[PDB]
Amino acid sequence: PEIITPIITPFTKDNRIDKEKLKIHAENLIRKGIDKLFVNGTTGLGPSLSPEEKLENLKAVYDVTNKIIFQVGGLNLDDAIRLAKLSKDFDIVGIASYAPYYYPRMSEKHLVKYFKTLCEVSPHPVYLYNYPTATGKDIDAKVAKEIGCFTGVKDVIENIIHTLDYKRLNPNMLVYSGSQMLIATVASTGLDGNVALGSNYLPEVTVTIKKLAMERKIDEALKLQFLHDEVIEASRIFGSLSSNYVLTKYFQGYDLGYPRPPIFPLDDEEERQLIKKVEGIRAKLVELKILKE
Amino acid sequence: PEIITPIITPFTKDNRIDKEKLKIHAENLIRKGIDKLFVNGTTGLGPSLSPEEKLENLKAVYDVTNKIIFQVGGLNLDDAIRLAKLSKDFDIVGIASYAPYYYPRMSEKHLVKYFKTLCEVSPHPVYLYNYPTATGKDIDAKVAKEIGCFTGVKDVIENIIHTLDYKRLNPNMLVYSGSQMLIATVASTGLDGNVALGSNYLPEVTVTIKKLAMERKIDEALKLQFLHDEVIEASRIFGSLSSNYVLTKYFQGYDLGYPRPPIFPLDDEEERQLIKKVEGIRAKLVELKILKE
Amino acid sequence: PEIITPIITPFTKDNRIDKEKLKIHAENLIRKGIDKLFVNGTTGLGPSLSPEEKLENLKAVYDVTNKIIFQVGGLNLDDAIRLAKLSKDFDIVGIASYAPYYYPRMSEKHLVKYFKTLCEVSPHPVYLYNYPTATGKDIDAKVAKEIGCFTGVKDVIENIIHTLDYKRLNPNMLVYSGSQMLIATVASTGLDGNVALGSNYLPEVTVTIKKLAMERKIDEALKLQFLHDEVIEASRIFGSLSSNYVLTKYFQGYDLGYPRPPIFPLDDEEERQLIKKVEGIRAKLVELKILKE
Amino acid sequence: PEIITPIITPFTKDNRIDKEKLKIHAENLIRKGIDKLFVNGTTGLGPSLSPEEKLENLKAVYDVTNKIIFQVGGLNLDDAIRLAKLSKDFDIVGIASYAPYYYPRMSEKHLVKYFKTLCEVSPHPVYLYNYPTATGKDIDAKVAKEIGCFTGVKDVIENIIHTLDYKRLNPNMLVYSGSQMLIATVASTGLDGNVALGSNYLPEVTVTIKKLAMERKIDEALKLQFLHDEVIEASRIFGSLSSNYVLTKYFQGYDLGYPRPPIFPLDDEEERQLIKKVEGIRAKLVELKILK
C-alpha cells in the first residue's frame, strides 16, 4: 500500500512559483512517510500552469526526491510531448496526464489517440490521471485497456468499484484510488494505494490510517478517518483548493504562500473562521499523539 | 456485518405475483446464508407494485422468514401510512421507504415531512432507502440526521464516503452500503453490511466473499469478487433487472418467472446469449467448490 | 398555434379527487380560451394517481369538454393498456404517456417496446409526453421516429432545438413545447403550440401572449412574458406543484383544494408570503386590463 | 439583431496559427454579412491557445475588421489582465471571458471576483461568455447582475428562457443566444442576436435565415434551418470542432488548415464520408440559390 500526495504548488505574491516553499513542503512530506509525490495535479493547480511552470515544479521537487509522478497534460499535445521528452533527464517514477478537458463531446478515438501519443514519446512509465468531475471525461478500465500502455492509474472518484475495474481488466496495472475514504482503499481491498487529497496538510493522519488499516485496527483507523473527514468538510466551506494552503500552514507550521487566482486566497476573516472550525481537531490529534504540540 | 438481499419479485406469465416461486427463492436465500431480505426494493420492482401487491409480497416472504425489511414508500403518502400500519401484525426487522420519486425540485422541508410522517405511524424501526439515481433525490447523512428517526440506512450508491458519512453523523444508525465492491464494504471499513444487488442469483458468492474478507483471505476474496463483477457486467447487456431472473434460474436451478413490463423479460435468444456469457464463470465456481455442478 | 393546459388535480382534505372543483376549473380554462386540457400530467400529479383515479379525472373533465389528451402511463404496462382501452368510449383528442420513470439504465429496445404496445392497443391518437428531468429518460426525435406511431409530442424541456428536431425528423407530427418561453414557441418558429405550465392560474396571460405574438406585438408580449416569469419564480420558493393551488385561487378566484402529499399544501404563512410576492404583479395585470379586479 | 461568428482558428500542419488563412476566412465572413467576429471562443479553440497566441489571433483578424469581440480568459488571471490591457490599442467592440474552467466547486464569490477584476482593467466593454457545458459553471442572469459590469452576454446553451432571464434582470445588457435554433433567436423574441456555431462554414445560410425571419417568411426560413441542422448533425459523426474545418473548405471553397491536437484533424477517409453526408445538402443550397 502506498500514499501518493498530490502536492500543492505554492505561489508568491507576484504569482510565480515559490520554489523554496515547495522544497520545504516536499521535504516534510517525505520525512512524514509519504511514498510518492504527484506534481501538477488538480491540487497543485496543474491546469493553471504553463508548460514551463509544470517543468519548474518538477525541478524543485526533484532536488528533494525522485519519488515523483510528473503530470504533463494539457490542450496543446505538442507541449505535453515536449514535457514528456524533457522528463527523460529525471530518474522519476513516471509521467501522467489527465484527459483533455473543457471541450465537450470528444470522440473516444481522439481521446485514445491523445494518450497513445504520450505513451509513444514517453521516456518513463505513463500513468492515467482520471478525474471525470474536472475533465468531463471518464477514461474507464475498458478504455484504459484499449489504450494499452498505462503502467498505472490514479482514479480520483468516489465510486470504488470503478477503480477496482481497472485491476480486474488490467491485472498488471498499478491502481490507486483518490477516494476520501482511505480506510477502504489504501490497503487490503485489491488496490495499490490512495492519492490522498488531504495529505498535504495532515500527512501524519494519512500515514497513520494506512498503518492502522494494514493492522486491521479498523475502529482506531475510523476515529482518525472521521477527524480527517471533518477537516475535509471544513475546507469546502470557502473552497478546498484555497483552504489547503491555510490548513497546511496551520497543521504543519510553515507557510505555503498563495494559490493562483482565480483560485483566490482565503481572506483574513475566512482564514480565521476555517481555523476556528479545525482547532478542536488539532487539539484531539495532539492528544492522540498523532501531531506534536 | 450482514448481507441484505433486495429480493426479486417473481411474476407469472399473466403478470401476477408468483407467491410459490417467491417462497422457494426466499427459502434458498436464507438457507445459503443471507441475513435479511429487503422486500419491494428496486430489484423487487417496488415502484411497479400496487400497495396491495407490496403487502402481498410481505405476506409471502413472511411465511418463510421474519428477517424482512418491508419497503412501503410511494407517491400517495396515505397508502404508505396504511402499509406501515398493516405491518404491526408482522414481527419484522423494519419498514423502509425511498424518497418521493419522479417530481423534480421537491423542497427539503417536504422531503423531511414525508419521512417524519412515516416515522410517526410506524410500529417498527424505519429504514431510509437511499437510491439517488432512481429517485433523483439524495437524502444524505445531514438530512437523515435532521429527520432524526431512522434506525438504519441502505445507501445504494457507489460513493463509499457518502455512506460512511451516515455513520459519522449518526453513530447509532445501522448503515449499509449498496456498493458492488463487497470486499471493501461488507467488513472492516466501519459499516454494518451490504445490500448486495447480485445476491439473488449467487448468494453463495456474496456470503463467501464476506467470510473470506473477515478472515483476511483477500486474494481469494478478490478472485470471487471479480467473478461476481463479470456476471454483473453481463447482466447489464440486456438490462440487469430483467437479467436477474435468468441468472437466478441458471445459477440456483429454479424458475423465477418474469419481470413486470416495462421491465420486459429477456426473450429466448437474449437468455441464451446471457448464459453463453456466464457459463465459463459457472464452471469456475464449480471448480472452486462455491457451487455444485 | 394552440395552448395546452396540464390541468391541476384538486384533492379533498380526505385525499380524494374533488370532482366538482375539477369541473369548475376545467370550465374556466375553456371559457378563458385554452385550446386543450392535458389530464394526468406532471402538474396534475399523474404519477401520484392510481389507474382508477386517472380515469376519474378523465370523466370529470369530459363532462365539460372533449378537448382532452388523456395521460395513461405508468410502471405497470397492463394498467396503461387497460386505461388506453377504457378511453375508447370518450371522443377525445388522444391518449399520452411519459416514458417509464424511476428505473435507471432502461434499454432503448424496452422503451420503444413500451410505447409501441400502447400504440397497438390505443383507440385514439397517441402522444409522447417527453419530460426527461422527471422520468430520467429522453425519448428524442430519433427514438420517436423509431417508435413510429406518435401523432404528437409534448416536449417538456427548455432545449428548443430538441423540440424542433421532432418536426424535422417527423414532419407530419404535431409538436408542442413545454418551454417557459411562450413568446418564442407559441407561434412563428415551426411548432404547433405550447404546454403552458402557468396557464392553470393565469390562462389570460398565456392566451394574451399568444395573440400578441401573432399580431407581431413582441414588445407588448415580452412585458407579459416577464410578469409570467416573475410568478413562475415566486412559485418555486415553496414548491411549484404546491404553489400552483394557491396561485390559481389567488388569480382565478376559486378554491382548488389540496395537492396530494408528499406534494404538501402550503401552510397559511407560506400562502401569505407567496401572495405578497405576486401582489404587485396582479395589480399590474389589472392595470393592463388582462385581469378584472 | 446580429449574427456573431465564433471564428475558427486555422493551424498549419506543424501546429502554428495560419494567419493568412485566418484573414481569408475573416474577410469572407464579413463579406457574406456576418456582423461581428468572436475570437478565441470554443470554436476557435481558445483554451488550446497560449495567451501569446490569443493576441496573435486578434492581430490577424484586426487586419481585416474591427468588428471583433476578443476572448481573453483563462486560469491565470494575470494573463487575462495583460490581454485585456494589450487590447487598448485595438478599436474593437469588446473583450470577453468564459468562467474559469476545469476546477469544480468554485465559489460564486471567487467567480464574481474573477469577472470584476477583468472589468476593472478592461479598456473596452466586457462580455460574458457563458458556456456551462464546457466550463462546468453557470454565470446566470442573477450572478451577471451581481457582477454588474457586463455590456453583454453570449449564452451558449439551448435553454432559451435562461437566456431571456438576462434581459429581464439586466434590461440594458446586450443578450445573445448560442442556441442552434437560429429561427427563434435571430429576431422577434427580445434578444439581440445569435452566436452561430455553424456560420463558419455556411454564413450564407445563417444570414439568409436572419433575413427571412425578420421578413416573417418562416416557412422558407424553416427549410434552411433544417438543412443547417442536418449539417450540424453530420459534423458530430467524427467530432464537430474537427469537422468544422472540412465543412468550411467544402462549402466555402478555401482551405482552413488543421485543428490543434487533441482536437485531431479528420483523416482522408473521414473527410470523404463527411462530404458524402452533406453533398446532397450542398446541391440543394445551390438549387435554392443560397450557394453558387
UniProtKB/Swiss-Prot annotation, chain D:
EC number(s) recorded for this UniProt protein: 4.1.2.55
Top EC category: lyase
A GO molecular-function descriptor: 2-dehydro-3-deoxy-6-phosphogalactonate aldolase activity
Active site residues per record: 154 (schiff-base intermediate with substrate)
Aminoacyl-tRNA synthetase in keyword set: no
Keyword Lyase: yes
UniProt KW keywords: Carbohydrate metabolism, Lyase, Schiff base
InterPro entries: Aldolase_TIM, DapA-like, ED_pathway_aldolase
Binding-site residues, substrate: 42-43, 129-131, 154-156
Domain of life: Archaea
Thermal dependence summary for this entry: Extremely thermostable.
Site positions (Proton shuttle): 129
Disulfide bonds: none
Protein's pathway: Carbohydrate acid metabolism; 2-dehydro-3-deoxy-D-gluconate degradation; D-glyceraldehyde 3-phosphate and pyruvate from 2-dehydro-3-deoxy-D-gluconate: step 2/2
Catalytic activities: 2-dehydro-3-deoxy-6-phospho-D-gluconate = D-glyceraldehyde 3-phosphate + pyruvate; 2-dehydro-3-deoxy-6-phospho-D-galactonate = D-glyceraldehyde 3-phosphate + pyruvate
Complex formation: Homotetramer; dimer of dimers.
Miscellaneous remark of the record: The metabolic pathway in Sulfolobus species contrasts with the situation observed in other microorganisms where separate enzymes exist for the catabolism of the two sugars, glucose and galactose.
PANTHER family with a match to the protein in the record: 4-HYDROXY-2-OXOGLUTARATE ALDOLASE, MITOCHONDRIAL, DIHYDRODIPICOLINATE SYNTHASE
Family: Belongs to the DapA family. KDPG aldolase subfamily.
Protein function: Involved in the degradation of glucose and galactose via the Entner-Doudoroff pathway. Catalyzes the reversible cleavage of 2-keto-3-deoxy-6-phosphogluconate (KDPG) and 2-keto-3-deoxygluconate (KDG) forming pyruvate and glyceraldehyde 3-phosphate or glyceraldehyde, respectively. It is also able to catalyze the reversible cleavage of 2-keto-3-deoxy-6-phosphogalactonate (KDPGal) and 2-keto-3-deoxygalactonate (KDGal). It is equally active with both D- and L-glyceraldehyde.
The protein's name in its UniProt record: 2-dehydro-3-deoxy-phosphogluconate/2-dehydro-3-deoxy-6-phosphogalactonate aldolase
